[PDB]
C-alpha cells in the first residue's frame, strides 16, 4: 500500500550534477572513500574535467548515484551503478554543514530527491 504522507520534517537543498562523456573516454573523476569518514569521498578531480563542471569538489558527498541511495552501499556497489548509468551520470552532492545536521538529526537523506 501506497498512502500519503502529511507534514513534513524538514528538507535540505541537494547539488545536482550532470556529467557527459563518450564511449570509452574517462569522465575525470573517480569515487573513493576515507577511513573514519561518512558518505562517499570524490577525489583526483581533473581540470576542465566534465566532472567538476557540475561543482564536484573534494570530499563531496553522493547522497545519491543516478538517483539511487548508496549509504549503506559497498564501494563496488556505487563504481558499478556510474558505468551501467550510460554516457550520463548524475550524482547528488550536499554541503558539509548541511550533511553533518543531517547524519546529526538522524533525517533521512535518501529521500532528498532535487
Known amino acids: ?32 572513500i576515507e577511513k573514519d569518514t561518512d558518505g562517499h569521498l570524490i577525489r583526483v578531480i581533473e581540470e576542465g574535467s566534465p566532472a567538476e563542471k557540475a561543482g564536484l569538489l573534494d570530499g563531496d558527498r553522493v547522497l545519491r548515484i543516478n538517483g539511487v541511495f548508496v549509504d549503506k552501499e559497498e564501494h563496488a556497489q556505487v563504481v558499478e551503478l556510474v558505468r551501467k548509468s550510460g554516457n550520463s551520470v548524475t550524482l547528488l552532492v550536499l554541503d558539509g554543514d548541511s550533511y553533518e545536521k543531517a547524519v546529526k538529526n538522524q533525517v533521512d537523506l535518501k529521500e532528498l530527491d532535487q
Open 1 to 32: 500500500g501506497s498512502s500519503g504522507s502529511s507534514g513534513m520534517a524538514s528538507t535540505f537543498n541537494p547539488r545536482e550534477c550532470k556529467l557527459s562523456k563518450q564511449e570509452g573516454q574517462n569522465y575525470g573523476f573517480f569515487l573513493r
